[PDB]
Design a protein around this ligand. Structure first.
Ligand SMILES: O=c1ccn([C@H]2C[C@H](O)[C@@H](COP(=O)(O)O)O2)c(=O)[nH]1
Lengths: 281, 281
């Protein structure tokens, strides 16, 4: 059995060999292919890429952030993770036409869509309990009562809420599958920077699976990663080629110290990555 | 280059050699695999499976039916296509708790989610003009002014309307990609019947790509079919083994004999499947 990270590196290799130049919103040139898929096993190991360090703290904290349904970047920032603070900037909002929102109000982003889909958004601190659909809980509920179900889906794509979001979601929708008391999850990313995003993303949805598996008495199965626009920045082509020569160190293991029963009851301390020996850069 | 149909056949061979036993809502039973993806070229050919005839008449009519925005099964019925009549009977409706809903009203399904996403659904006779988000037209629009856009998406999965639907959409969402004048599309299908279903879908969406290509002045590129729960029904196991031995016939070529302006003014007469040579059924 070949190391799982080989699929990821292979996808990069494929972008180079078969990709074409495609400009991004800012006009910057990239190399991309449309439609890709990788399967990462979650059995006795976590797919936290080793050919380059992954910002785990960001991964773990941000997820917990989505689970709380938070749409205030400040709440995530106070944890040491600033990856969302940019979009919560005062002047940033004004240019988007949200001069009325306070600093931190990201809009109906991931958190909101996950637990209040369809609800009427307003303030990053309004009451939404009872409003909209709680896809997350519903997904968990379905895993238990009807594991054969083929509708275990959590969609963050809300055409209606798009104009109110700081930026459209990258993770359009994810699906969960149950068979032989094993939990698998496929994720649909409409776009992914193979060098910066994808690795962070793989972790996120792999971690989420572990959680829901743990809460539902199941064993993590596979994490399928489906991409829409798989790209690489043209200027990063050289560094990437160097990375593509690194040999993947065996994947780390994820351990949940205490036992949890509800999803919202997970805390940063509950987890711990062991044996993460990534390459320096 | 090899015959594109091999992608499909290959996936069936895989599902047979690795698909694990799994049941459905009816508890029927089928071999299943979670997470599959196939690429189909749309260049100077149309992926209309040849190792087994496809209900083209049905595909073409059903699509126009979606575009129209119709949610009445009687519409597709009155064409020689009753595939949606079953879920629109006086019995099936009551079964689901829609005594009020009159025969035919399939609820807020594809046509609705495609031209009026979000709009509060009343009934198949209500006027939804100027309501919800016209995803279809918006996609067309973006492809024309900003082809590099990585958000070109058409999502038919609306958690808020799922309960009001005669059945959850098998085609969660689709994303369009444009590069080098070539238009490509990817479909996310949560559940797929390899026997009679996937072949039909591969066609439905390939056609959608061609149509949108024509009105945007782009040439057909690739159609990436991504499956979630890919399965082969236990009984279909035999009928398929024979098909796997049938040599694939060169894919036909769609022909749009007429210059169509907008997506709405399209007709079944406008198309022609040239040299389509299936296999004995
Ligand atoms: O978790 C993340 C966070 C950010 N991005 C970034 C990488 C791409 O450069 C960017 C593209 O954004 P759009 O141009 O598609 O809006 O998304 C991800 O893919 N995944």
């Amino acid at each position: 059995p070949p190391h799982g990270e080989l699929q990821y590196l292979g996808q990069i290799q494929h972008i180079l060999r078969c990709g074409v130049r495609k400009d991004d919103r800012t006009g910057t040139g990239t190399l991309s292919v449309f439609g890709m898929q990788a399967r990462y096993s979650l059995r006795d190991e976590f797919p936290l890429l080793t050919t380059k360090r992954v910002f785990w703290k960001g991964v773990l904290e941000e997820l917990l952030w989505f689970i709380k349904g938070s749409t205030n970047a400040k709440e995530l920032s106070s944890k040491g993770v600033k990856i969302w603070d940019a979009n919560g900037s005062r002047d940033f909002l004004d240019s988007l036409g949200f001069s009325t929102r306070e600093e931190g109000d990201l809009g109906p982003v991931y958190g909101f869509q996950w637990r209040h889909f369809g609800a009427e958004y307003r303030d990053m601190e309004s009451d939404y309990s009872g409003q909209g659909v709680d896809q997350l809980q519903k997904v968990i509920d379905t895993i238990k009562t009807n594991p054969d179900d083929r509708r275990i889906i959590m969609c963050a794509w809300n055409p209606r809420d798009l104009p109110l979001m700081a930026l459209p979601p990258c993770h359009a929708l994810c699906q969960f599958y149950v068979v032989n008391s094993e939990l698998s999850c496929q994720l649909y990313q409409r776009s992914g920077d193979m060098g910066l995003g994808v690795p962070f993303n793989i972790a996120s949805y792999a971690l989420l699976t572990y959680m829901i598996a743990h809460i539902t008495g199941l064993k993590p199965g596979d994490f399928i990663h489906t991409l829409g626009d798989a790209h690489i920045y043209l200027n990063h082509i050289e560094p990437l080629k160097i990375q593509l020569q690194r040999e993947p160190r065996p994947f780390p293991k994820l351990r949940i110290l205490r036992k949890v029963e509800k999803i919202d009851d997970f805390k940063a301390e509950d987890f711990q990555i062991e044996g993460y020996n990534p390459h320096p850069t």
